[PDB]
């Protein structure tokens, strides 16, 4: 009947049309902290005008002090150490670097880089296993080789940058552990709703966490995927909070707004429109999943429940 | 003992510090002909101010009508066809595409590209055998693969460009033949004086050319290497012409001026200074070789003669 259900639209895109072509600079390392850094203990700010929200609305903060999560963009090793130090002041539990990036990435001579393909879909369609194997192989192959690292500029194409002969290669896991943080990888595709396997994996991981665990989520920019998992965590941990309050508060501390809003993209970014719409509906479906399965201890996972309760456009 | 004689300064540079890192766009294909296109039948023009020459001087044109040579920058396949068509109106002999580029280059989906390393020295130090093997391997590896092709902008680094999955790969030899030209490759390093090996190969090639052969020389930009071989050919074929006349006329038809001039360089280009000085001295030494070895029909090759008669800085 249906080729791709709601929540799996990206599966229709062709991986061969977005293969990696350059080592993208993930962070210039000029700031002490990564971009969009925020924690669940932060004060709520005014909502961004583009979401056309009620600036007078004061969402409930119930459970935010105990939530213990944070989010940010990619970072240099030094920046991550700064994050870890800062998060250690808020807790005595393990601090996790939850890496949500499907795209292959790592560090060349301490420089955070990723193998970038159009739309940042260089690993689209790969299983987590295949994406991580590609990553390990590409990182290693760069050792003692000349590479071109560049930030993206006009038209999302390389602009300036630098050329160097790599003397050191590290995975983010190594960088996290060196910063004193535990590491957990979830290979989520950039710009789209996390897959049923991404979410099943996160929920399984969530279940094993000690009470005082602190989760620092991050993606490339620290907006789309980062806010999605932050929201999922808030819903799971504070199931009595209304959907409206979760969405407003995760937005007002510095994340994306995952509720309905007037979507307007630049003509060259019109491809994003349906993925934004898809995220709005899936966000609602996840909330329903939590509400309907919390009472029995989640004896049925998200992927299974979603197939029997498909989302609709 | 002397480590590197005059004429071989580049041998002191380390190849590993200039490895290739991007497919550089050799020509955008917007014009009908490659840049700096010129032939020995062209009228002489005013000299460029930067060379501080005598604009009143009238160079002898002795032997130019019979010289039968031309030069230009790199080109797209369509531009080469236009060149070949244009040269065919000037001769009924074989027309050669004399490719002077040591850097690995070719055509991806008809687009002329080269594997660019800093200073365009990605094949520095390699024998012609090794340079051509690198080229063959890289061009073939590009087939059915995704590549990033870009022109150089600020800092001599990629700027903009395009990404594509290659469906066709061709060597310049194939493109030359398709244009009705014979092909002859001389792997000369960009920016420096051609090596004794490059010149020995050229001289051997020159010696068995048909009387009516037309040589179309080209490099990347069509100035340094291209003019050097046009000057060498002019000297060889018209030995009675004075050095001054040869240098002025090859410059006034649109080439570089290979005589003494006030060398100027931006701070970032200060490395080029000694290479320009070296070319000036080597031009004089080659002229001396032609004058002293033409009587016996060049029984002594340039490389051998140069070691017994080293140039002076």
UniProtKB/TrEMBL annotation, chains A, B:
PROSITE patterns: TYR_PHOSPHATASE_1 (PS00383), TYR_PHOSPHATASE_2 (PS50056). 1D-myo-inositol hexakisphosphate binds at residues 24, 156, 191, 220-225, 272, 276, 279. InterPro entries: Prot-tyrosine_phosphatase-like, Tyr_Pase_AS, Tyr_Pase_dom. Residues 200-247 form the Tyrosine specific protein phosphatases domain. CDD domains: PTPLP-like (cd14495). GO terms for molecular function: hydrolase activity. Keywords: Hydrolase, Signal. Pfam families: PTPlike_phytase. This is Myo-inositol hexaphosphate phosphohydrolase. It comes from Selenomonas ruminantium. The lineage of its organism: Bacteria, Bacillati, Bacillota, Negativicutes, Selenomonadales. The gene is phyA.
